[PDB]
Coordinates of C-alpha atoms in Angstrom, one line a residue:
Chain Z
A510 CA -36.1 133.5 149.6
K511 CA -39.7 134.6 150.5
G512 CA -39.6 137.2 147.7
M513 CA -39.3 134.5 145.1
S514 CA -42.1 132.5 146.8
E515 CA -44.4 135.4 146.6
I516 CA -43.7 135.6 142.8
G517 CA -44.2 131.9 142.4
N518 CA -47.6 131.9 144.0
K519 CA -48.9 134.6 141.8
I520 CA -47.6 132.9 138.6
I521 CA -49.2 129.6 139.6
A522 CA -52.6 131.3 140.0
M523 CA -52.1 133.0 136.6
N524 CA -51.1 129.6 135.0
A525 CA -54.4 128.1 136.2
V526 CA -56.4 130.8 134.3
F527 CA -54.4 132.1 131.3
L528 CA -53.1 128.7 130.1
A529 CA -55.1 126.2 128.1
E530 CA -55.1 122.4 128.8
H531 CA -53.2 121.5 125.7
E532 CA -50.4 124.0 126.4
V533 CA -49.7 122.3 129.8
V534 CA -49.9 118.8 128.2
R535 CA -47.2 119.8 125.7
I536 CA -45.0 121.3 128.4
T537 CA -45.6 118.3 130.8
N538 CA -46.3 115.1 128.9
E539 CA -48.6 113.9 131.6
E540 CA -52.3 113.8 132.4
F541 CA -53.7 117.3 133.0
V542 CA -55.1 118.0 136.5
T543 CA -57.5 120.9 137.0
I544 CA -58.1 123.2 140.0
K545 CA -61.4 124.9 141.0
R546 CA -61.4 128.6 140.1
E547 CA -62.8 129.8 143.5
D548 CA -60.1 127.8 145.3
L549 CA -57.3 129.9 143.8
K550 CA -57.6 132.4 146.7
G551 CA -56.0 130.0 149.1
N552 CA -52.9 127.9 148.3
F553 CA -54.2 124.9 150.1
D554 CA -52.5 122.2 148.0
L555 CA -49.2 123.8 146.9
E556 CA -46.0 125.1 148.6
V557 CA -43.3 127.2 146.8
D558 CA -39.7 127.5 147.8
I559 CA -36.3 127.9 146.0
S560 CA -34.3 124.8 145.0
Chain B
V103 CA -7.9 108.7 117.3
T104 CA -11.3 107.9 118.8
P105 CA -14.4 107.0 116.9
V106 CA -17.4 109.3 116.8
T107 CA -20.1 106.7 116.3
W108 CA -20.2 103.0 117.0
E109 CA -19.5 102.0 113.4
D110 CA -16.3 104.1 113.2
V111 CA -14.2 101.9 115.5
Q112 CA -12.4 100.2 112.6
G113 CA -11.6 103.5 111.0
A114 CA -10.1 105.0 114.1
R115 CA -7.8 102.0 114.7
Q116 CA -6.5 102.0 111.2
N117 CA -5.8 105.8 110.9
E118 CA -4.2 106.0 114.4
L119 CA -1.5 103.5 113.6
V120 CA -0.8 105.0 110.2
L121 CA -0.7 108.6 111.6
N122 CA 1.7 107.6 114.5
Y123 CA 3.9 105.7 112.1
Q124 CA 4.5 108.6 109.8
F125 CA 5.6 110.9 112.6
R126 CA 7.7 108.1 114.2
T127 CA 9.7 107.4 111.0
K128 CA 9.3 110.0 108.3
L129 CA 9.7 113.0 110.7
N130 CA 11.9 114.0 113.7
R131 CA 9.3 114.1 116.4
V132 CA 11.6 115.6 119.1
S133 CA 13.1 118.3 116.8
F134 CA 9.7 119.3 115.4
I135 CA 8.2 119.7 118.9
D136 CA 11.2 121.8 120.1
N137 CA 10.8 124.1 117.1
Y138 CA 7.1 124.1 117.5
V139 CA 7.0 125.5 121.1
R140 CA 10.0 127.8 120.7
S141 CA 8.6 129.4 117.5
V142 CA 5.3 130.2 119.3
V143 CA 6.9 131.4 122.5
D144 CA 9.6 133.7 121.0
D145 CA 7.7 135.2 118.1
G146 CA 4.4 135.3 119.8
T147 CA 2.7 133.0 117.2
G148 CA 3.6 129.9 115.2
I149 CA 3.0 129.1 111.6
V150 CA 3.1 125.5 110.3
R151 CA 3.2 124.5 106.7
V152 CA 1.6 121.2 105.6
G153 CA 2.6 119.6 102.3
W154 CA 2.8 116.1 100.8
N155 CA 6.0 114.6 99.4
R156 CA 6.0 112.2 96.4
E157 CA 9.1 111.0 94.5
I158 CA 7.8 108.0 92.5
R159 CA 10.3 106.8 89.9
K160 CA 9.9 105.0 86.6
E161 CA 11.2 101.4 86.5
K162 CA 11.5 98.6 84.0
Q163 CA 10.9 95.1 85.2
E164 CA 10.4 91.6 83.6
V165 CA 6.9 90.8 84.7
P166 CA 5.9 87.1 84.3
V167 CA 2.6 85.9 82.8
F168 CA 0.9 82.7 84.0
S169 CA -1.3 80.4 81.9
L170 CA -4.7 79.6 83.4
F171 CA -6.1 76.1 83.5
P172 CA -9.2 74.8 85.3
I173 CA -9.2 72.5 88.4
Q174 CA -7.9 69.1 87.3
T175 CA -8.3 67.6 90.8
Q176 CA -9.5 68.6 94.2
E177 CA -6.1 67.8 95.7
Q178 CA -4.7 71.2 94.6
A179 CA -8.0 73.0 94.9
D180 CA -7.6 73.3 98.7
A181 CA -4.5 75.5 98.1
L182 CA -6.8 78.2 96.7
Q183 CA -8.8 78.6 99.9
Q184 CA -5.7 78.1 102.0
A185 CA -4.2 81.3 100.5
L186 CA -7.6 83.1 101.0
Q187 CA -7.7 82.0 104.7
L188 CA -4.1 83.0 105.2
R189 CA -4.7 86.4 103.4
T190 CA -7.7 87.2 105.6
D191 CA -6.0 86.0 108.9
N192 CA -2.6 87.4 108.1
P193 CA -2.2 89.6 105.0
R194 CA 1.5 90.1 105.6
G195 CA 2.2 86.4 105.9
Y196 CA 0.3 85.7 102.7
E197 CA 2.4 88.1 100.7
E198 CA 5.8 86.7 101.8
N199 CA 5.4 82.9 101.4
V200 CA 2.5 82.2 99.0
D201 CA 3.6 81.5 95.5
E202 CA 3.0 84.0 92.7
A203 CA 1.1 81.5 90.7
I204 CA -1.2 80.9 93.7
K205 CA -1.4 84.7 94.0
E206 CA -2.6 84.8 90.4
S207 CA -5.0 82.0 91.1
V208 CA -6.7 83.8 94.0
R209 CA -6.5 87.0 92.0
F210 CA -8.6 85.4 89.3
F211 CA -10.9 84.0 92.0
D212 CA -11.5 87.5 93.3
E213 CA -12.4 88.8 89.9
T214 CA -14.6 85.9 88.8
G215 CA -14.8 83.2 91.5
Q216 CA -13.4 80.5 89.1
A217 CA -10.8 78.2 90.7
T218 CA -8.1 78.0 88.1
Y219 CA -4.5 76.7 88.1
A220 CA -1.7 79.0 87.2
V221 CA 1.3 77.8 85.1
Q222 CA 4.3 80.1 84.3
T223 CA 5.0 79.9 80.6
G224 CA 6.4 83.3 79.5
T225 CA 7.3 86.8 80.6
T226 CA 7.7 90.3 79.3
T227 CA 9.5 93.6 80.1
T228 CA 6.8 95.9 81.4
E229 CA 7.0 99.6 82.4
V230 CA 6.1 100.3 86.1
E231 CA 6.5 103.2 88.5
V232 CA 7.9 102.1 91.9
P233 CA 6.6 104.3 94.7
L234 CA 9.2 106.2 96.7
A235 CA 9.1 108.9 99.4
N236 CA 5.3 108.9 99.5
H237 CA 4.8 110.6 102.9
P238 CA 3.5 113.9 104.3
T239 CA 5.7 116.7 105.4
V240 CA 5.4 119.4 108.0
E241 CA 7.6 122.5 108.3
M242 CA 7.7 125.7 110.4
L243 CA 7.8 128.8 108.3
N244 CA 9.7 132.0 109.3
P245 CA 7.0 134.7 109.8
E246 CA 9.0 137.1 107.6
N247 CA 8.8 134.6 104.6
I248 CA 5.0 134.3 104.7
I249 CA 2.3 137.0 104.1
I250 CA -1.4 136.7 105.0
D251 CA -4.4 138.7 103.9
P252 CA -4.9 141.6 106.3
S253 CA -8.6 141.7 105.5
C254 CA -9.2 138.3 107.1
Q255 CA -10.7 139.9 110.2
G256 CA -8.5 137.8 112.5
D257 CA -9.3 134.4 111.0
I258 CA -7.1 132.3 108.8
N259 CA -10.2 130.5 107.4
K260 CA -11.6 133.8 105.9
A261 CA -8.3 134.8 104.3
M262 CA -8.5 134.9 100.5
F263 CA -4.7 134.6 99.7
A264 CA -1.4 133.7 101.2
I265 CA 2.2 134.0 99.8
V266 CA 5.1 131.9 101.1
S267 CA 8.7 132.2 100.0
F268 CA 10.9 129.1 100.2
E269 CA 14.1 127.7 98.8
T270 CA 14.4 124.8 96.3
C271 CA 16.6 123.2 93.7
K272 CA 16.2 122.1 90.1
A273 CA 16.5 118.4 91.2
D274 CA 13.8 119.1 93.8
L275 CA 11.5 120.4 91.1
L276 CA 12.3 117.5 88.9
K277 CA 10.8 115.1 91.5
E278 CA 7.4 116.0 89.8
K279 CA 7.6 115.2 86.1
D280 CA 4.5 117.2 85.1
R281 CA 3.6 119.6 87.9
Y282 CA 5.9 122.4 86.5
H283 CA 6.1 123.9 83.0
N284 CA 8.5 126.2 81.1
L285 CA 11.3 125.3 83.6
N286 CA 14.0 125.7 80.9
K287 CA 13.3 129.4 80.4
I288 CA 14.6 130.5 83.8
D289 CA 18.2 131.2 84.6
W290 CA 20.0 129.7 87.7
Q291 CA 22.2 132.8 88.3
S292 CA 19.4 135.3 89.0
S293 CA 16.7 134.9 91.7
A294 CA 19.4 133.5 94.0
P295 CA 19.2 134.0 97.8
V296 CA 22.0 136.5 97.4
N297 CA 19.7 138.5 95.1
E298 CA 16.6 138.2 97.2
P299 CA 16.9 140.4 100.3
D300 CA 13.2 140.0 101.0
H301 CA 13.6 136.3 101.9
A302 CA 15.1 135.6 105.3
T303 CA 17.3 132.5 105.6
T304 CA 20.3 131.0 107.5
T305 CA 22.2 130.2 104.3
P306 CA 25.4 132.3 104.1
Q307 CA 25.3 135.1 101.6
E308 CA 28.6 133.9 100.1
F309 CA 27.6 130.2 99.8
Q310 CA 26.9 128.7 96.4
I311 CA 27.0 125.3 94.7
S312 CA 28.7 124.8 91.3
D313 CA 26.4 122.1 90.2
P314 CA 23.4 123.6 88.3
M315 CA 21.2 120.7 89.4
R316 CA 21.8 121.4 93.1
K317 CA 21.6 125.2 92.7
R318 CA 19.7 127.0 95.4
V319 CA 16.9 129.3 94.2
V320 CA 14.0 131.2 95.9
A321 CA 10.5 130.3 94.9
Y322 CA 7.1 131.9 95.7
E323 CA 3.8 130.1 96.1
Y324 CA 0.4 131.7 95.9
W325 CA -2.4 129.9 97.8
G326 CA -5.9 131.3 97.9
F327 CA -9.3 131.5 96.2
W328 CA -9.7 132.9 92.7
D329 CA -12.7 133.4 90.4
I330 CA -11.3 131.1 87.7
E331 CA -14.5 131.2 85.7
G332 CA -16.7 134.1 84.6
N333 CA -19.7 132.7 86.4
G334 CA -18.6 134.4 89.7
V335 CA -17.6 131.6 92.0
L336 CA -14.2 131.5 93.8
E337 CA -12.1 128.4 93.5
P338 CA -9.0 127.4 95.5
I339 CA -5.8 127.5 93.3
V340 CA -2.1 127.2 93.8
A341 CA 0.4 129.2 91.7
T342 CA 4.2 129.2 91.7
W343 CA 6.6 131.6 89.9
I344 CA 10.4 131.9 90.0
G345 CA 12.3 134.9 88.6
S346 CA 9.1 136.7 87.3
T347 CA 8.2 133.6 85.3
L348 CA 5.0 131.6 86.0
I349 CA 5.8 127.9 86.1
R350 CA 2.8 126.3 87.9
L351 CA -0.9 127.1 87.9
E352 CA -3.5 124.6 89.1
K353 CA -6.4 124.1 91.5
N354 CA -5.8 123.0 95.1
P355 CA -5.0 119.2 95.0
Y356 CA -5.6 118.6 98.7
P357 CA -9.1 117.3 99.6
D358 CA -9.3 119.9 102.4
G359 CA -10.0 122.7 99.9
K360 CA -8.4 125.5 101.9
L361 CA -5.0 126.8 102.8
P362 CA -2.5 124.3 104.3
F363 CA -1.3 126.7 106.9
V364 CA -2.0 126.6 110.7
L365 CA -1.8 129.6 113.0
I366 CA -1.0 129.1 116.7
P367 CA -0.9 132.2 118.9
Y368 CA 0.7 132.3 122.3
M369 CA -1.4 135.0 123.9
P370 CA -4.3 135.7 121.5
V371 CA -5.2 139.3 120.6
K372 CA -8.9 140.2 120.4
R373 CA -10.0 139.7 116.8
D374 CA -6.4 139.4 115.4
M375 CA -4.1 136.7 114.1
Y376 CA -0.7 137.4 115.6
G377 CA -0.4 136.9 119.3
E378 CA 1.8 138.6 121.9
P379 CA 4.9 136.9 123.4
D380 CA 6.1 137.4 126.9
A381 CA 8.7 139.9 125.8
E382 CA 5.9 142.5 125.2
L383 CA 5.2 142.9 128.9
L384 CA 8.8 142.7 130.2
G385 CA 10.4 145.4 128.1
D386 CA 10.7 147.9 131.0
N387 CA 11.5 145.4 133.7
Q388 CA 14.5 144.0 131.9
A389 CA 16.0 147.5 131.3
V390 CA 15.5 148.6 134.9
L391 CA 17.0 145.3 136.2
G392 CA 20.0 145.8 133.9
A393 CA 20.7 149.3 135.2
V394 CA 20.8 148.1 138.8
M395 CA 23.2 145.2 138.1
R396 CA 25.6 147.4 136.2
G397 CA 25.6 150.0 139.0
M398 CA 26.5 147.3 141.6
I399 CA 29.5 146.1 139.5
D400 CA 30.7 149.6 138.8
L401 CA 30.7 150.4 142.5
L402 CA 32.8 147.3 143.3
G403 CA 35.0 147.3 140.1
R404 CA 36.1 151.0 140.2
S405 CA 36.7 150.9 144.0
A406 CA 40.3 150.5 145.2
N407 CA 41.1 147.1 146.7
Chain J
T561 CA -17.5 120.0 132.2
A562 CA -15.6 116.9 133.5
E563 CA -16.7 117.5 137.1
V564 CA -20.4 117.1 136.4
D565 CA -19.8 114.5 133.8
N566 CA -17.8 112.3 136.2
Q567 CA -20.3 112.8 139.0
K568 CA -23.2 111.9 136.7
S569 CA -21.6 108.5 136.1
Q570 CA -21.4 107.8 139.9
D571 CA -25.1 108.6 140.2
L572 CA -25.8 106.0 137.5
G573 CA -23.7 103.5 139.4
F574 CA -25.5 104.4 142.6
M575 CA -28.8 103.9 140.9
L576 CA -27.6 100.5 139.4
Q577 CA -26.3 99.5 142.8
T578 CA -29.4 100.6 144.7
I579 CA -31.9 99.0 142.3
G580 CA -31.8 95.2 142.3
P581 CA -30.5 93.9 139.0
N582 CA -33.1 91.2 138.8
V583 CA -36.1 93.6 138.4
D584 CA -35.5 94.0 134.7
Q585 CA -32.7 93.3 132.2
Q586 CA -33.8 96.3 130.0
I587 CA -33.5 98.8 132.8
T588 CA -30.0 97.5 133.7
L589 CA -28.8 97.6 130.1
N590 CA -30.0 101.2 129.6
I591 CA -28.2 102.4 132.7
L592 CA -25.0 100.6 131.5
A593 CA -25.4 102.1 128.0
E594 CA -25.5 105.7 129.5
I595 CA -22.3 105.0 131.5
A596 CA -20.5 103.8 128.4
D597 CA -21.4 107.1 126.6
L598 CA -20.1 109.1 129.6
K599 CA -16.9 107.0 129.3
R600 CA -16.7 107.8 125.5
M601 CA -17.2 104.2 124.3
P602 CA -19.7 104.4 121.5
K603 CA -19.1 100.9 120.3
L604 CA -19.7 99.3 123.7
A605 CA -22.8 101.4 124.3
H606 CA -24.3 100.3 121.0
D607 CA -23.8 96.7 121.8
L608 CA -25.5 97.0 125.3
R609 CA -28.7 98.5 123.9
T610 CA -28.8 96.0 121.0
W611 CA -27.8 93.0 123.2
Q612 CA -30.2 90.1 123.2
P613 CA -30.1 86.8 125.1
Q614 CA -28.8 83.7 123.4
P615 CA -31.7 81.2 122.9
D616 CA -30.9 77.7 124.2
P617 CA -33.0 75.1 122.4
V618 CA -32.1 72.1 124.7
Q619 CA -32.9 74.2 127.8
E620 CA -36.4 74.7 126.6
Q621 CA -36.9 71.0 126.0
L622 CA -35.7 70.3 129.5
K623 CA -37.9 73.1 130.8
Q624 CA -40.9 71.7 128.9
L625 CA -40.2 68.2 130.0
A626 CA -40.3 69.2 133.7
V627 CA -43.8 70.6 133.2
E628 CA -45.2 67.4 131.8
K629 CA -43.1 65.4 134.4
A630 CA -45.3 66.8 137.2
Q631 CA -48.4 66.1 135.3
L632 CA -47.6 62.4 135.1
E633 CA -46.8 62.3 138.8
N634 CA -50.3 63.6 139.5
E635 CA -51.8 60.9 137.2
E636 CA -49.5 58.4 138.9
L637 CA -51.3 59.1 142.2
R638 CA -54.7 58.9 140.6
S639 CA -53.8 55.6 139.0
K640 CA -52.4 54.3 142.3
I641 CA -55.6 55.5 144.1
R642 CA -57.7 53.5 141.7
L643 CA -55.6 50.5 142.6
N644 CA -56.0 51.1 146.4
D645 CA -59.8 50.9 146.5
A646 CA -59.7 48.0 144.0
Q647 CA -57.7 46.0 146.5
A648 CA -60.0 47.0 149.3
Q649 CA -63.1 46.2 147.3
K650 CA -61.8 42.8 146.3
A651 CA -60.9 42.2 149.9
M652 CA -64.5 43.0 150.8
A653 CA -65.7 40.5 148.2
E654 CA -63.6 37.7 149.7
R655 CA -65.3 38.2 153.1
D656 CA -68.6 36.7 151.9
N657 CA -66.9 33.3 151.4
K658 CA -65.7 33.5 155.0
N659 CA -68.7 34.9 157.0
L660 CA -71.4 33.2 154.9
Chain V
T561 CA -0.7 111.5 127.1
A562 CA 0.0 108.8 129.7
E563 CA -2.4 110.4 132.3
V564 CA -5.5 110.0 130.2
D565 CA -4.3 106.7 128.7
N566 CA -3.8 105.2 132.2
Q567 CA -7.1 106.5 133.4
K568 CA -8.9 105.1 130.4
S569 CA -7.7 101.6 131.3
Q570 CA -9.2 102.0 134.8
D571 CA -12.5 102.9 133.3
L572 CA -12.4 99.8 131.2
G573 CA -11.7 97.8 134.3
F574 CA -14.5 99.6 136.1
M575 CA -16.9 98.7 133.3
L576 CA -15.7 95.1 133.3
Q577 CA -16.1 94.9 137.1
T578 CA -19.5 96.6 137.1
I579 CA -20.9 94.4 134.3
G580 CA -21.4 90.8 135.1
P581 CA -19.0 88.6 133.1
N582 CA -21.8 86.1 132.4
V583 CA -23.9 88.4 130.2
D584 CA -21.7 87.8 127.1
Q585 CA -18.3 86.4 126.3
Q586 CA -17.9 88.7 123.3
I587 CA -18.4 91.8 125.4
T588 CA -15.9 90.7 128.0
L589 CA -13.3 89.8 125.3
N590 CA -13.6 93.1 123.5
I591 CA -13.1 95.1 126.8
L592 CA -10.0 93.0 127.6
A593 CA -8.7 93.5 124.0
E594 CA -8.9 97.3 124.4
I595 CA -7.0 97.1 127.7
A596 CA -4.2 95.0 126.1
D597 CA -3.8 97.7 123.4
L598 CA -3.6 100.4 126.1
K599 CA -0.9 98.2 127.7
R600 CA 1.0 98.0 124.3
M601 CA 0.5 94.2 123.9
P602 CA -0.6 93.8 120.3
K603 CA 0.0 90.0 120.3
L604 CA -2.2 89.5 123.4
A605 CA -4.9 91.7 122.0
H606 CA -5.1 89.9 118.7
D607 CA -5.5 86.5 120.5
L608 CA -8.4 87.8 122.7
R609 CA -10.5 89.1 119.7
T610 CA -9.7 85.9 117.8
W611 CA -10.2 83.6 120.7
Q612 CA -12.8 80.8 120.3
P613 CA -14.0 78.1 122.8
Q614 CA -12.6 74.7 122.5
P615 CA -15.3 72.2 121.4
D616 CA -15.7 69.2 123.7
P617 CA -17.2 66.2 121.8
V618 CA -17.7 63.9 124.8
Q619 CA -19.4 66.8 126.7
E620 CA -22.0 67.1 123.9
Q621 CA -22.8 63.4 124.1
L622 CA -23.3 63.6 127.8
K623 CA -25.3 66.7 127.4
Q624 CA -27.5 65.0 124.7
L625 CA -27.8 61.8 126.8
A626 CA -29.2 63.8 129.7
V627 CA -32.0 65.2 127.4
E628 CA -33.2 61.7 126.3
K629 CA -32.7 60.4 129.9
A630 CA -35.6 62.6 131.1
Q631 CA -37.7 61.5 128.2
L632 CA -37.4 57.8 129.2
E633 CA -38.3 58.7 132.8
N634 CA -41.5 60.3 131.6
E635 CA -42.2 57.2 129.5
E636 CA -41.3 55.1 132.6
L637 CA -44.2 56.7 134.5
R638 CA -46.6 56.2 131.7
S639 CA -45.6 52.5 131.4
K640 CA -46.0 52.2 135.2
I641 CA -49.4 53.9 135.1
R642 CA -50.6 51.4 132.5
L643 CA -49.4 48.7 134.9
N644 CA -51.3 50.3 137.9
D645 CA -54.8 50.2 136.3
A646 CA -54.1 46.8 134.8
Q647 CA -53.6 45.4 138.3
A648 CA -56.7 47.2 139.6
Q649 CA -58.8 46.1 136.6
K650 CA -57.7 42.5 137.1
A651 CA -58.5 42.8 140.8
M652 CA -62.0 43.9 139.8
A653 CA -62.4 40.9 137.5
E654 CA -61.5 38.5 140.4
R655 CA -64.3 40.0 142.5
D656 CA -67.0 38.3 140.3
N657 CA -65.8 34.8 141.4
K658 CA -66.2 35.9 145.0
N659 CA -69.5 37.9 145.1
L660 CA -71.3 35.8 142.5
Chain L
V103 CA -28.1 118.4 125.9
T104 CA -30.5 116.8 128.4
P105 CA -34.2 115.9 127.8
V106 CA -36.9 117.7 129.6
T107 CA -39.5 114.9 129.6
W108 CA -39.1 111.1 129.2
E109 CA -40.0 111.1 125.5
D110 CA -37.4 113.7 124.6
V111 CA -34.4 111.3 125.1
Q112 CA -33.9 110.6 121.4
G113 CA -34.0 114.2 120.5
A114 CA -31.4 115.2 123.1
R115 CA -29.0 112.6 121.9
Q116 CA -29.3 113.5 118.2
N117 CA -29.0 117.3 118.7
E118 CA -26.0 117.0 121.1
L119 CA -23.9 115.1 118.6
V120 CA -24.7 117.5 115.8
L121 CA -24.2 120.6 117.9
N122 CA -20.8 119.4 119.2
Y123 CA -19.7 118.4 115.7
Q124 CA -20.3 121.8 114.2
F125 CA -18.2 123.5 116.8
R126 CA -15.5 120.8 116.5
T127 CA -15.0 121.1 112.8
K128 CA -16.7 124.2 111.3
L129 CA -15.4 126.5 114.0
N130 CA -12.1 127.2 115.9
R131 CA -13.3 126.3 119.4
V132 CA -10.1 127.5 121.2
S133 CA -9.9 130.8 119.3
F134 CA -13.6 131.6 119.8
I135 CA -13.4 131.0 123.5
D136 CA -10.3 133.2 123.8
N137 CA -12.0 136.0 122.0
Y138 CA -15.2 135.4 124.0
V139 CA -13.8 135.9 127.4
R140 CA -11.3 138.7 126.5
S141 CA -14.0 140.7 124.7
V142 CA -16.2 140.6 127.8
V143 CA -13.4 141.3 130.3
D144 CA -11.7 144.2 128.5
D145 CA -14.8 146.0 127.1
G146 CA -17.0 145.2 130.0
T147 CA -19.5 143.4 127.8
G148 CA -19.5 141.0 124.9
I149 CA -21.7 141.0 121.8
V150 CA -22.0 137.8 119.7
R151 CA -23.4 137.6 116.2
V152 CA -25.2 134.4 115.1
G153 CA -25.7 133.7 111.4

């Protein structure tokens, strides 16, 4: 379970850098929310676990 | 029958009653089912033939003719809409009791909307064709009497031709007045089931009928796709020949546009048409079991008692 | 599969039961329409989504009459109030002929 | 098969029970008509789809009379209001003979 | 077919009916399934061609 959580955290950090705003809007038809680049070191606001 | 979309409810109800009625009256439902399962279980696969039956006959009748006059008074004008109301609410009741003159009156109303009286003044001998035996037919074909294209790659839909051998009589062929041609050239002594070892049947080899009309003969049908035009497109056709004489050649009349045969395998084989019955796996077990039973009887039977 | 399909219908019923039907007719109709599709009733489902309330003309007149009914009652009090001080003021006038 | 046919009838009953009967008479009648067909009652099913409410003439007159009944009550208040200020204004007139 | 976002409900309904119709009429559903499982079980893997 933790192995998938480790993968999820890395992808979330990548998604906040390598994905443009419009790409997220198309995937999720909601208002886009941004995250500070220097804050990606710590996962303060997110928790990842299997469903 | 269940509708697919919301506007198909009326169609589903109408077809379901008609389809059930045909199997209830025109066919032996119990016998067909018994042959349906047993053919699949024993032979490993079942083949069903679908065909329509039509035996319309010519008839001469003295049809009446009615003179048409306009509405003289409103007193009889209500009878026009009364038939219309009865027809919409109960079509069967309208046919049985409403007068023919009133039927002509509403008939002209449907064509033009003019309310006209009908008076019977004369009649004539017309020529009509009374329908008879207009119902579909389903049959189970012996697998030895039907040949399918080997290159179908295990799919009846991709097969390009199919040949089925079946028995018939001259009177049976006469049911259609124009479907067959050159029927007089053939002889009724040759092409008999006695002279056709390739066709398997339960008819005794010594059996025959003296009446030429009811003579039993073997016929071949060719169903498949052929390039009937030089353009290079295949078209579904049906051909029939008896005694090396071609008597029928026409396109597929059914709206389906493909072969009327259905294949049902018992245990399907990977990328193949014919399935495997249960007898394939029990060949050795039955032989071994038979040996044990005979040994037990021989021990008891031959022993002194 | 029938297992998930049947269980989905129960969830729709659970949502319909949990949510008060009075919050919105449209929400209730849409949930019922999905249930009809899961039950393979295309004709019923089409009617539910296309269903509209039947307008009642006499009900609107009675509804409108009640609105103006209360307005006249308020004016009735104001009319009566103008009568109350009129009687009192006339009573005050009649004093002068007594305590002259 | 009888298994699916019987289960289909229960679903129709479930839909009828779940949906409030007051939303539409036509929807309720159509569901009942399908149940009758599943029960092999063609005569009953035909009646349900062709069923119509019986018109009551006296009920309409009573219904219409109630509409105009409220209209007269509103006019009654307006008539009474015109009486209220009339009494007050006449009372004002009688003051002048007192405080002259 | 199930929608991903709230505005995809119409698309899911349309495609689901079309997709089911094609397998119901244009293809032998029972025969395809029988060959589908047996090919995987016997050979150890199944290969499907789409055209």
